[PDB]
Point group: D2
Chain length 289, copies 4
């Protein structure tokens, strides 16, 4: 059993004034709230028990959007981050939720797309000891956790936002952990409690799997107003080309058989007037390979 | 002249993007949607403004904008329990309007262009009857449509006609004399109190001024996920080209001399880390024609 | 041995006046000529001997861009289509070029992206008898050749631009053929000589492989001014995110070991001032997984 | 006043996109780039226009535009053997200019906004000295930069200064009296004949008019792959919103009464199948204010 955490603790003042009224992870990417994308990621990894961590202020808005998850065959719980004291704090806040189980942490503002993404998630989820992370070639590795590889393609170092990156390989905001993570997190000293320190702890124990997320995958940037807009245009282009949605949670739950035709039809009813509800209706009758 | 921004529900049209929060709190590029119509009223020289929103979202608008005193405005708030037409704004706003002239702007309407201040000025100076703006669009059937005679006189208004008489849509910006509240009270639901019925009342009295908003102005659509995205790209292109912002309320208040250098500097302080605060700081030292 | 054909015969007057001065397939998609994308596709399928079919007018422009291909470890030949009399005409024009070999036809305006695209091409290229095509879920199947599947997922019919498509599965502009194709093409009667008639001929002989190109692949539309612009924005988003190019022929030739470090350095020299040349230089020193 | 469009080489800056054909023949959305500056000269009331291009591309410009008689223009052509500065336009154009007033526009400059015809009109009516336009940009170091004194008088011009005195760039639109050819003949290479040197010559004689092009105008960048794409999206957003075209030369000629209904109908005929021809047909019957 692997449990999911979505860290949706806003973005401080970075995207103000756009994010003054509402948390970053409730802003739409094209046609759906940002959080639908990482939620859909956990769902594709087969995870149904998910903790959403947000600000005290925005927890009710996340709860109004997503409920307890029962409508999508999920169990959603909620926890608050009073102060953004690092990503690794997710494991202390989430300690009781995690218990003795395996976990996956996804950032609430990370968008993924591509062929065999389910297999890339599957390989990390099946490793039931140590930690699994993904390395993706980016233009601006200095913004991220950077992985250095030896001539043999083995991961040998992790640096958080290095001014002189050793590679162009950034660690994506998707992390798989065994039962050691909470204890590793409790022993961290502030630099913020750094996720890169958690990942370096596993690396030093020789228990960090670093899989390449290939250039054929899109790992999208929602860090700036410019990149948020590009992410919107990217999803819009795919969806209007295909007549298929990216990270429609109702669709993923239906295809995982976590909800049946009758439940999906009920979810379509109140959205029947717009394209999203019409999309859910079409899913009941169409064969999609 | 007193201002009203109608920032009510779009029902379920943009769901699930708008499930968590009102359309008019979503960003267009770098700032909340409501900054654009607010900036429009400010450019028309209006400082006393009623913001009408859903019962749920009124506190979010209040948290974003306060009483307006920081921007040299007087902001008041009212709720629209149910979206029963745009004309309801004048009943909700009746006590706020009192015996004064008024301007209604829709909370999801974006305007841009040269001498926009003069186009607003001409409508605002006409102290009797009503002034509206007609703009050539591809899809007039979505709007209030103006029909003109061979002499270019306005002779009919139709709300979302199946067979539009012209390609000229009425924009979501309306100037009214002291007759508007009484005209609104006498309206019967169509099940909505139609702004087009208010405007037809003035037309039949021969007291409706219909000024052409030329093709050299951008009147932008935020009605669909596609058009919301285009509006973001449109503002981003102008702002990144110019190093100047469209509809920055702090800037407009400063340039109208509604706040001084000292007040603007104080507003910059809490945003000093991001581009928006840095922009407000640059405004103190730079000459912009 | 499999030989490649790129059909780049313009677009008649469909995209006029944009295409009045130059052929569609010489228009850029972001940073590189459209034809670089299908050329890169054939190169990824391991094809080095490629016939480019274009108008008499534009052949010299294609020749000025691409030469004989020797700089990229290719052998490029050129043939003219006097009149656009259907896609299947490619096999009559290309008859002597093809000889007794296997072939692949790609449309000069088709863009592909995704993970394991090389494997999808590999599976079609290794089938040395019959024909292989790809089916992709689209919004507007009525614009394309449409594949109908039985309950078992076997292809049972092909229709060219049906007013009432049997599925949302369009045949992409990428076709693999055995030595039968030229003879099948010679026996066709005008409806234009239809590629769908060629593919139906193989289906009726039970020699048509239809592989699904999954929703995790991008098959992009360059049919309209709107879709051409979206294709540009799509590539720009991926390339600026990754610091890696999509369909850089110099890169693909280098990674296939069709050219060495010394040849790549020579190709970089005349482009050294711009980002494209700087990209080719960085390829000499960087490990990319 | 006679017009010159300088549509010469951008060297290798946009290679390989511009390897096959000149920048100014690439489309911006739905029409060749050169349609935009041509439309600019036409809006300034200029019918006699010299098009300067590379030796290679002159025939392509001639094939696109002819002698202009179909649009009520007189188009002549000249070649720039080597891109040795913008001021060379006046030596190449010397015989074409003769004893007349002139306007130079860059072939890759796009303008949009309300009363643009009046901004052009004011410069065109000044029959002595030179008129240029100053526009606030983020990156003034890329352009000719105007410095103003406390009174808003222009006091210096610098070409691509490392330390810009202001954020005010000179746009690629220049109005000149009969002095310009002689001023140009006396210029020494910097290794380019600089337009900024021509403009500084007029400034030192106190005969340079520098009018502000306000933030309500769009002056668009086609200097980079990124900015070319944004220009396309910008025009597409306006045209799809309005159902009206920006810089349709047939429309501008018709509205200036340089061609009649019968001539416009003939121009529509060969384009009748696509949206551009259908647009020209609609212009014959529709009243547009
Ligand atoms: C485009 N993708 C995607 C989808 N593509 C995944 C196809 C590959 N696949 C097969 C299976 C069978 N277990 N699971 N995944 N699917 C299909 C799906 C099929 C079966 C179960 C779940 C989802 C989907 O419904 N929505 C999707 O959005 S994706 O790149 O894998 C993705 C992207 C972002 C979030 C979640 C999934
Ligand atoms: C780009 N525009 C605009 C601005 N352009 C307006 C320039 C025309 N103008 C001159 C004056 C001088 N009294 N007022 N307006 N200005 C300048 C401004 C100067 C003085 C007072 C108010 C605003 C501004 O600060 N922000 C702006 O966003 S705009 O197209 O007219 C506009 C569009 C939508 C909302 C608000 C403004
Ligand atoms: C993003 N892709 C892509 C690339 N991705 C392909 C990676 C998968 N792969 C491994 C191999 C080893 N034979 N070949 N392909 N590669 C890498 C590459 C590696 C080895 C050989 C050729 C190209 C590349 O250089 N340019 C690319 O543009 S892609 O989706 O397969 C592609 C898209 C469009 C045209 C050609 C390829
Ligand atoms: C949107 N603009 C524009 C147009 N807008 C200009 C309207 C202002 N105007 C009124 C008049 C009446 N003599 N002339 N100009 N017009 C209208 C027009 C009407 C009469 C004569 C010429 C053009 C047009 O046909 N195409 C246009 O593209 S524009 O911003 O001024 C422009 C920008 C760049 C090139 C050419 C025009
Ligand atoms: Cl890949
Ligand atoms: Cl106008
Ligand atoms: Cl700034
Ligand atoms: Cl897939
Ligand atoms: Cl202005
Ligand atoms: Cl039309």
């Amino acid at each position: 059993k692997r449990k999911g955490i979505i860290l949706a603790g806003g973005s401080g003042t970075r995207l103000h004034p756009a994010t003054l009224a509402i948390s970053k992870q409730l802003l739409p990417v094209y046609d759906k709230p940002m959080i639908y994308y990482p939620l859909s990621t956990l769902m594709l990894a087969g995870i149904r028990e998910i903790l959403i961590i947000s600000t005290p202020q925005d927890t009710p808005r996340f709860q109004q959007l997503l409920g307890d998850g029962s409508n999508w065959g999920l169990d959603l719980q909620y926890a608050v981050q009073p102060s953004p004291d690092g990503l690794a704090q997710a494991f202390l806040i989430g300690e009781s939720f995690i218990g003795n189980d395996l976990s996956a942490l996804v950032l609430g503002d990370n968008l993924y797309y591509g062929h065999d993404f389910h297999e890339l998630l599957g390989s990390a989820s099946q490793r039931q000891t140590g930690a699994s992370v993904f390395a993706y070639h980016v233009l601006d590795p200095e913004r991220y956790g950077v992985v250095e590889f030896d001539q043999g393609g083995k991961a040998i170092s992790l640096e958080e936002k290095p001014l002189e990156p050793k590679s162009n390989y950034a660690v994506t905001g998707l992390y798989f952990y065994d039962q050691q993570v909470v204890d590793i997190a409790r022993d961290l000293k502030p630099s913020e409690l750094e996720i890169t320190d958690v990942n370096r702890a596993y690396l030093e124990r020789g228990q960090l799997s670093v899989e390449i997320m290939g250039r054929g995958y899109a790992w999208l940037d929602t860090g700036t107003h410019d990149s948020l807009l590009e992410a919107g245009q990217f999803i819009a282009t795919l969806e209007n080309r295909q007549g298929l949605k990216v990270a429609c949670p109702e669709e993923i739950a239906y295809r995982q058989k976590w909800i049946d035709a009758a439940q999906l039809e009920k979810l379509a009813a109140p959205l029947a007037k717009n394209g999203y509800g019409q999309y859910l209706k079409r899913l009941l009758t169409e064969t999609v390979y």
